[PDB]
Design an enzyme around this catalytic site. Sequence first.
Site, PDB file in Angstrom:
ATOM      1  N   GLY A  66      43.152  47.022  46.149  1.00 25.26           N
ATOM      2  CA  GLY A  66      43.302  48.453  45.982  1.00 25.26           C
ATOM      3  C   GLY A  66      43.824  49.155  47.217  1.00 25.26           C
ATOM      4  N   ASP A  67      43.303  48.778  48.382  1.00 28.01           N
ATOM      5  CA  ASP A  67      43.625  49.420  49.650  1.00 28.01           C
ATOM      6  C   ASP A  67      44.136  48.409  50.672  1.00 28.01           C
TER       7      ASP A  67
END
Length: 331
Positions: A66-67
Amino acid sequence: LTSYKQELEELKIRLNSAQNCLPYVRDNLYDRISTRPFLNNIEKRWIAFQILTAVDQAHKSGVRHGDIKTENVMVTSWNWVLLTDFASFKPTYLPEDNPADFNYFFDTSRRRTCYIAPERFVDGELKRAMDIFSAGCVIAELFTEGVPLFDLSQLLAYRNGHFFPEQVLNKIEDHSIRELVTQMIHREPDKRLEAEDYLKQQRGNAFPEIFYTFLQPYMAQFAKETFLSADERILVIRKDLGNIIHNLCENGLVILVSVITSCLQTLKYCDSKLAALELILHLAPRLSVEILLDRITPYLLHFSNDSVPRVRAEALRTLTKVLALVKEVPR
């Protein structure tokens, strides 16, 4: 947050197959951009391949990053780019409610780098879409290093329609690499969940098509906790180098030299060091005018100091003779 702790533990158990994951090491990918700043182009391509593999392996194992970001990309003493710190605690589609918390949590480099799909904005478990957006952002950052394509403010403007990464993209040199990283990095109502297609595109030209199948394998095998000792690992490296040479008859030599230096931190057997030099000697044929000169002198001297007179003698002899064939000089 504690529930996200169990989620991350399960994701780590899953990604165990993901050798490209590292749930101390040299530094983060952005830290390698900063400290120990020898981000060779060969190393870069290798780091990109490692990152794509880490993201794909986490996803397949059942882990969504996600990041993913250059700061979030982990490297070892040999530039082992392994994904980790999957932000199961961070939102998949991150709410824009508080930018103060966004800076306090998402950004740890102070560049406010925003590796999040614009569809991760205003109109549970993580999503491969946010992970892929973050990974493409991290690849583009590695292309621009310091330059965050879209910081908290920049990414917020892009989501609201006020910022464009065209400039930051210009930071990247390689046209095709930037094009692919950006195609990954866009508003992601349609989720490009995995990096496997990008990995396939890079293996044709970027990622080593066949070399990695062996280079990545040996890297993962000797990564850590390996049964063979660093000196035994070095003898095995000599064997694998003979194998790579036969395959042929920078890159590994670069990455291989990277691991050689990583292990060099320790002494172990003296004759082990002698052999290592002997082997490190052969590899130089390509790096003569490269990271070799960059640090080959460094270690060769550091290696040629301790105790044994004839040992250090041959050590200096190598440090020089190899240092010799070069035919170009950096300032």
